[PDB]
Amino acid sequence: ALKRINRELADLGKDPPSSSSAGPVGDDLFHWQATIMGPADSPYAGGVFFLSIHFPTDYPFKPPKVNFTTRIYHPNINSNGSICLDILRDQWSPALTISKVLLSISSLLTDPNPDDPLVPEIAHVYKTDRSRYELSAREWTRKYAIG
Amino acid sequence: TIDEGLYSRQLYVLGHEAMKQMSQSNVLIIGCKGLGVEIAKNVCLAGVKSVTLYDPQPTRIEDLSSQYFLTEDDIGVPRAKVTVSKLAELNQYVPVSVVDELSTEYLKNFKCVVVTETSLTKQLEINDFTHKNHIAYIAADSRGLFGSIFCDFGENFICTDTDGNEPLTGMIASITDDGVVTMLEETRHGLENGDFVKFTEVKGMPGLNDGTPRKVEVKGPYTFSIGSVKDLGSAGYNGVFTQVKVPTKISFKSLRESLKDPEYVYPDFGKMMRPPQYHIAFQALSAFADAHEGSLPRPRNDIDAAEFFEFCKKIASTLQFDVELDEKLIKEISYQARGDLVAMSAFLGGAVAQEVLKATTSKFYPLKQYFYFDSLESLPSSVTISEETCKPRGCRYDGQIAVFGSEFQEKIASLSTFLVGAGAIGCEMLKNWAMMGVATGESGHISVTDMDSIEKSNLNRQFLFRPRDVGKLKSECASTAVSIMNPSLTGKITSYQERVGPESEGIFGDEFFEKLSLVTNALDNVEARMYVDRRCVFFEKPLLESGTLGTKGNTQVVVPHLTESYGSSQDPPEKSFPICTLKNFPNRIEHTIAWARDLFEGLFKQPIDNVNMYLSSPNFLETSLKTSSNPREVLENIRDYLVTEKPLSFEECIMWARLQFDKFFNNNIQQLLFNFPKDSVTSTGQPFWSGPKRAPTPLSFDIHNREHFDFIVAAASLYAFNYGLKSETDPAIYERVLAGYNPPPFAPKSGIANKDKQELKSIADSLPPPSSLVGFRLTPAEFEKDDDSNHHIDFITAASNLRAMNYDITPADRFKTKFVAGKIVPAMCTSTAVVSGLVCLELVKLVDGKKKIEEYKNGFFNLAIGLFTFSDPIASPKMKVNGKEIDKIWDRYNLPDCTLQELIDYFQKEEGLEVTMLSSGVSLLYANFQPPKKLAERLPLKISELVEQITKKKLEPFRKHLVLEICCDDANGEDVEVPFICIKL
Amino acid sequence: MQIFVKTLTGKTITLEVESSDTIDNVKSKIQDKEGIPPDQQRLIFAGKQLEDGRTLSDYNIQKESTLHLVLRLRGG
Ligand SMILES: *P(=O)(O)OC[C@H]1O[C@@H](n2cnc3c(N)ncnc32)[C@H](O)[C@@H]1O
Ligand SMILES: [Mg+2]
Ligand SMILES: [Mg+2]
Fold first, then answer.
1. What top-level class would CATH report for the domain B115-165+245-410?
2. Domains plus CATH for chain A?
3. Where in this protein does the record say Phosphoserine is found (chain B)?
4. Which residue is catalytic, options B151, B312, B390, B580?
5. Are B22 and B43 in contact (CB under 8 A)?
6. Contact indicator for B70, B63 with CB cutoff of 8 Å
7. Sheet holding C12-16: strands in order across?
């Protein structure tokens, strides 16, 4: 576990992550804090979102537990920060790095999927009244994702 | 009337109908030696109607080599008479009897007849009668390291289930006019050619829903074909298909006919020419016994071997066998004729008991018909095995000395083993060790650890534990039982009650692990297996792993510096459903059961823990606000479970249960249908509630309905238990108190600077001060499945069935709900016996210290289909480090307790490598990218001091080493794998 | 060349391969037909566990050969 985690950390260090920044907390290798920048072409533009990543003992043979910390108004992210991503529950394989997980999360932010929602009310607002969803997302990202 | 409190694990393998048929079948067992007693024990534990024994031969000392129900005080007494008393205690529902005389016409009273230790003429006489009267006949034999099984269930045997697999089911996406059935997106049907399926809920082709099975023509992993459905319709949409399993007609041949033209079952495809040899060899053994007044060839005797080979040649000539006899193998069969090993007895007894269950239940595929097995790779080669060393000494180990010799017996008696776990495999392993004489010498010792206690359901396959032992520690009872079996083990066994893990390293430390000879795992979870494997790798000890699941089993051996460890391979992980599926859109009973377990945890465990922590920690509120993602939930739970909804009587508990019923089965469904109406469409125009998504319907409470009342009773009882009230089960109070409920109005909500901090502060201030409430605690509900009076499984079943009725899913019962929610592993006594036999056959290889990797065998088997297979262990990978051959698993660096700078200098100067990362445990001691100030602070510190400083915890006094993981780069900058570092404190 | 793979649960699989194919290709075919990742497959032929990086001809696997697909179990 330690070897794989350090290899991923070094790979992140060598290659510029640009719109992401993941690293261990304190000196603990099984607890990372990551930052995601809201896409410009999205309601979350100009926002910084903090994520907590917990690597299990069986890593990379079990998926990391990735949870949002900054509150976000998204159809696939609930109030506990849980993310509806298939690669984190049952599609995880011991060949996916944290960089690909962060890219998947950024793609999820860039376009939600209301056909299989995790928060039905937000999905209903998105499908019915798009402008109100846009306003709510902008207000939430200005109220929580900026600071 | 099956006692599910005892047969809980076995019913998950066999079923109710199978055990119902079993409980009406009689089994006769001829022969009461180790093999016969093993078969009888497994049959009694299985639960057949009755067992009858026939063995009038007086007991002899050598018989104690594998007969664990015989003591040295029973010499000269018939074996059946002294064995029936001990067998009658295993199961109270299975009487055990003894017959002093056998007649042919007496055989008609039995469903199955098992024959051991009998000559071929008697076997022919018995089979000529059983075959024509339709009685199942099984004949087993165990000669040294060789074994044989023969099954004959009649000419017209009917097998209802041929593989023991649950019927396959799946969801369809479309059915064309030509029968091309297509599964959903990326869903595999898993069918094979020639299978039968039935369809339900098919729209557009109602004819397919009648229920007639149809042939399956597999065309790919995602689609298959059923034929021409031109008349039934043009196209069908959605639906569910379920596999149909049909009975099979199996025809057996009699023993007399089968001797001439046998049909072999091959336990190993690496040696496919041997079973023809063993077929002649065993018949020659019978002929030799006939010609010498029933006396087998003497151990390692050359004259008897020559005579036996002459018999083999004569028999091969008579049977017109066009085979070439391997003289070495046949004479090896001759040498070990008088051997009686407990491992072979356990292996063959498990197999034969499974065959008996197949005969009595008409389930699983029987053997057809001869099963010849050998474990000749277990014969020692580091000691002298001759006539002089193999002659009997008049002791209880004569049966084993006849195979291995006295010197190997002395080697066995000086073992210092460590057994982790005391379950079914643990009990079998301890019994095998007691019979083999393990650790009965001056320098021998056995250590067994297990932190659990004996339960009622454990007695079904752990034969060392009696009903009087319920509530005591497993290890102590097992130690006492095996000391009774072999009195020489008095004082040679130490039992612990410790869980093997990171917290027990003060007991199982360097001193403990340095005196061992081998470690045997008898665990039931992968985490403990990985931990023990890491400990064995660090201490370089042999490890014996074994696992079972229903009728399947496997055994693996880990040898230092030779093979890979247990953790070098991967296993399929458990299935975890997407959170969206569980939370909103379930379509299987497993989804509803998982949701109900989460509901139980969130109603009876988490709020109680929050309340208790609020009254203990003096700084819980601020820490929760800072750390917890959603402090609102914690504050609301504390408020509700302290002041808002604290029950003063059981009536308020019933009202709370009614409120929760409305909350979780009527209102959330209304909200969901408000957000996504039943007529809504997706972004592409298709209906939303189609396929994997099932449209729900709110439930209206009806007191007379069984499921609603069950949920109300269970929820009220659990809430009262949380608040320590006097719960009741009288329906009158429920009826009179639920007739006055006033449902609060509910209407789904459409929605439409930072004051939430003020709201949180106001909520926090409303809570009573912790100082005022001291000593007031609420009891959280800890999930427990084995108790049938704590309402846990009742509540989970009721909630799961109510949610199933929400989404129109077929509800389950308490049996399946307990199986799924409880994560029960199906277990069998026969599989346990087989795995113990294989492990004890590898143990003698470990004792002999064999070096070649082709002499060890990892074993896999499935008794439902009669499949056995073996493969050599995988050799540990090698790598090149600084131009040297280094083992990637078993090699390490040994260094003193030097400073970090000195460690880096050593790796730069000795190995020519640059250290880039250095970690210990979970911390990060050193990394090449850390700022210069932090490094300059951490450079001149010793490794122990550095670890203590970073982890903020002193090293324990018993700690004697540190394990460090290091990643380093070569001169060119290429990363190179290196072994771990062992710092000596 | 055509080979057969028998699972520990009794299923049978037919694979169309060539003697020069590597074990990785066979594992990929088994994954396609079963969905089992190549790193979780344990293949046995004639008492030898097949290891990645070698070819079929190394194990003398010829037409109509039978392999066994096994796995470890966690009870005890
Ligand atoms: P089977 O499920 O019948 O019995 C398994 C036994 O193994 C013991 N066990 C499980 N896990 C551990 C650890 N970590 N340490 C020691 N013993 C363990 C159970 O108590 C069962 O007796
Ligand atoms: Mg227990
Ligand atoms: Mg268990």
1. alpha beta
2. 2-144 (3.10.110.10)
3. 251, 876
4. B580
5. no
6. yes
7. C12-16, C2-7, C66-70, C42-45, C48-49
Pairwise CB contact (< 8 Å): B867 & C6: yes
* Ligand 3 centre distance from Cα of residue B514 (Å): 29
Query: What is the helix (H) or strand (E) element at residue B831, kind and residue range?
Result: helix B829-848
Distance (Å) of CA B393 to CA B61, B386, B880: 10, 14, 53
Ligand 3 centroid–CA B825 distance in Å is 7
| C-alpha span between B32 and B81 (Å, rounded) | 10
CB spacing of B751 vs A67 below 8 angstroms: no
3-class DSSP state of B664 = helix
Exposure of B102 by Cβ count < 10 A (0-12 exposed, 13-18 middle, 19+ buried)? middle
* Residue B361: both structure tokens together: 């239940």
Tell me how far the alpha carbon of residue B449 lies from the centroid of ligand 2, in angstroms: 14
Residue to mutate (ligand 1; options B9, B452, B461; most atoms within 8 A of CB): B452
- Closest C-alpha to B444, from B374, B477, B515, B492: B492
| Side-chain-side CA neighbours of residue B506 (13 Å) | 6
Read off the DSSP letter of residue B640. Answer: I
SS3 B476: helix
Residues of chain B with Cβ-Cβ distance to A123 below 8 Å are 675-676
Cα Dmax for chain A: 49
**B862, closest residue in chain C (CA to CA):** C8
Whether C73 lines ligand 1, by a CB cut-off of 6 Å, is no
Question: Does residue B474 have its Cβ closer than 6 Å to ligand 1?
Answer: yes
- Copy the structure tokens of residue B145: 């390291």
Which ligand 1 atom is at minimum distance from the Cα of B452?
20
Would you call B968 a catalytic residue per the annotation? no
| CATH 3.40.50.620 holds for B892-985 | no
Cα Dmax for chain B: 105
Q: What tokens does A18 get?
A: 């640009």
The burial class, CB within 10 Å (0-12 / 13-18 / 19+), for A137 is: buried
B866-899 in b/e form (b: 16+ CB < 10 A) is bbbbbbbbbebeeeebeeeebbebbbbbebeeeb
Q: How many CB atoms lie within 10 A of CB B660?
A: 18
- State whether the beta carbon of B457 lies less than 6 angstroms from ligand 1: no
Q: Any binding-site annotation on B452?
A: yes
The resolution of the experimental structure, rounded to one decimal in Å, is: 2.7
Is A67 close to B575, i.e. CB distance below 8 A?
no
Technique employed here was cryo-EM
Domain ranges of chain B: 1-114, 115-165+245-410, 166-244, 411-569+825-891, 570-824, 892-985
Which atom belonging to ligand 1 lies closest to the Cα atom of B523? 7
Domains along chain C with CATH numbers: 1-71 (3.10.20.90)
Question: Could you tell me the distance, in angstroms and rounded to a whole number, from the CA of residue B648 to the centre of ligand 2?
Answer: 36
Cα of A129 to nearest chain B Cα, Å: 11
Closest alpha carbon to B24 in B118, B112, B127, B142: B112
How do the residues of chain B divide into helix, strand and coil, expressed in percent and rounded to 5?
40, 15, 45
DSSP H stretches of helix in B362-501: 387-390, 398-401, 406-413, 424-436, 474-485
Q: Ligand 1: does its nearest atom lie under 6 Å from the Cβ of B452?
A: yes
Instruction: Write down the residue that tokens 């780069």 correspond to.
Output: B969
Q: Which ligand is nearest to the CA of B548?
A: 1
Atom of ligand 1 nearest to the CA of B449: 16
Written out in words, the top-level CATH class of the domain with range B166-244 is mainly beta
Asked if residue B828 has its Cβ within 6 Å of ligand 1, the reply is no
For residue B103, how many other CB atoms are within 10 A of its CB? 7
Of A84, A105, A119, A123, the catalytic one is: A84
What residues contact A105, with CB distance under 8 A and at least 6 apart?
Answer: A36, A51, A66, A83, A85
Phi, psi of B111 (to 5 degrees): -75, -35
